[PDB]
Amino acid sequence: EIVQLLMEHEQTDITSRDSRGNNILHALVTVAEDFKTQNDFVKRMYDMILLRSGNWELETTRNNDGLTPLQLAAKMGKAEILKYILSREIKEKRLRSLSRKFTDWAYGPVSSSLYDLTNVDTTTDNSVLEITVYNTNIDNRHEMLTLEPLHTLLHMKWKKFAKHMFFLSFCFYFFYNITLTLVSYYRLLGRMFVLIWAMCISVKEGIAIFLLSDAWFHFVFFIQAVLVILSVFLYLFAYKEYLACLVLAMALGWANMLYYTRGFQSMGMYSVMIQKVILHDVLKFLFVYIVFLLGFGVALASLIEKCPKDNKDCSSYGSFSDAVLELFKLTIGLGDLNIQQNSKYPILFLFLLITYVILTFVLLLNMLIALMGETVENVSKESERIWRLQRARTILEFEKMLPEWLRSRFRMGELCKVAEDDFRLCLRINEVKWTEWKTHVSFLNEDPGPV
Amino acid sequence: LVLAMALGWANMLYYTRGFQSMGMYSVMIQKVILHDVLKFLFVYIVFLLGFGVALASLIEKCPKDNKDCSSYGSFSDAVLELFKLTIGLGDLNIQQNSKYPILFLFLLITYVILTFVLLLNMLIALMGETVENVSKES
Amino acid sequence: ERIWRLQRARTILEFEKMLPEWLRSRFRMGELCKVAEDDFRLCLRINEVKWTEWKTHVSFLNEDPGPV
């Protein structure tokens, strides 16, 4: 009521930017915490204020940061307000311009909604899409992407070219790794292309990391390329030994191949499960297990510190590294076990060695508990939100790798006419609604024909 | 003939599908082998090749005509040793017929770790859907 | 999680008991505040936010909402 009173006065200045430069709309976007908290009233005030001023000025302006209110809601973790903005259908014939969501035709429950892509597509300097995707500050990007226009843009771009580009890069990397394997196993015409590709990806990864738990793979590729260039430079020198590092990069290369399983749906979910959760858990598991290994191997080597007496087979665990290897054998089940000689207390030796096994077993059971507990519900949704998010990030990466003229050629979206003699980009999406029935007063085209 | 025998005794499982308990049993077999196991097998074959090439490369050091000295000599031999290891039958030991025991051991340990983690993720992906969808779908 | 929080509180109290009087006096959490009728007592501050329950705030110690 007070807002109505204020807007009715002619002395009022709706367009007044504060010291920070923000309009009313930027401010409201700075406040939309979530639905469970507010009960979604700020959206109502946004709508009312727009309807009080039939113009584009408020949404067009920028703050001192240089961002529209839309770009601002994308910058923050603000979804409901964005869902509203990107989907506005105003029945008022006079204020039809302000709407972004348009119904081209509604013969019945089937109808083609015509969304708008003025500052949403990647054509602008900073699109809503790049803003949503290239910020890890929010931790809500999945709820941001599931919206109609952005979701459809991403999947249509994947349908057009990005699938081809990803398969292309995967084929190149597959060829590269096959060449590396052939070179290493049997150790010139192929090695040249290998080295050139290595230097290319080295420069790429270096630049990307200079620009920089998602970017780990960049460091992985960088390490692989560094190892490859190092081994190839050392090869020129008369050093047979240096070549030993080659297989290391090869092994690392195969880890990089895991990255490309991120593409397929099932394989992608499986790969994210490989990457994140298992890292988080098994890294701590491995750290504690290694400290156990050291703490027990030192003791065992100390007990068996007794002299061998011209018998090395009697000196099992004799070397500390040898003792660690023997416990590795034991936990896996490789090492022939027996009551060790050269121990003043063989019974206590065996007791400690069995306590090792019991501790390792209960430790395995602990990690199993942690994994099965996390795997219930958090893993599914988290892995989906990570997978689709990384896919969209890489889609935009491929799109940025391109030049201007090709992008122009593609031209996602169709130019279309909106009332009041306007022409703008739009996106057509066919959708059905059985629950709601109504006379479609707001329709762009009388004839529901597709063409 | 013998192959058929094997396949034949894999086919009796079919008739187990009659019983309700054995019915859900066989259907769980089918669903798991279709969904989770193929991923494990494929990517594990990938790792087998990626690591066995390197193992054979290091084992390229000639044993002077002694297959026992330079274990992991043949590529298929190294893969068989890796299989025994993942089952635990092998008799591992630092091979004097090698230029680098340190790198050999580190790579073998990383292989074992990766295999264990991959098996573990197979188990996790199983448990994830285990509770809700399995019973009803079966 | 319950046992974790519980044992962490136990440890915190143990370490607090390990300290001397003067360091404890230094790390005293809370602040003196005037409540009512020449009453000065210790208090703990928590800034809270509520978007649901709307009401004209009648009862308040300080007229100016400034932190200091």
Author numbering:
A (entry chain B): 276 to 462, 484 to 508, 518 to 756
B (entry chain C): 551 to 688
C (entry chain A): 689 to 756
Structure paper excerpt:
TRPV3 is most abundantly expressed in epidermal and hair follicle keratinocytes where it plays a key role in the maintenance of normal skin physiology. The TRPV3 channel, like other thermoTRPV channels (TRPV1, TRPV2, and TRPV427–30), is a fourfold symmetric homotetramer.
To elucidate the conformational changes governing transition of TRPV3 from the closed to the open state, we determined structures of the channel in the presence of the agonist 2-APB (TRPV32-APB). A single cryo-EM dataset yielded three distinct conformations, TRPV32-APB 1, TRPV32-APB 2, and TRPV32-APB 3, all of which resolved to ~4 Å resolution or better. The reduced symmetry is conspicuous in the pores of the TRPV32-APB 2 and TRPV32-APB 3 structures, where movement in the C-terminal region of S6 in diagonally opposing protomers results in asymmetric gate arrangements within the channels.
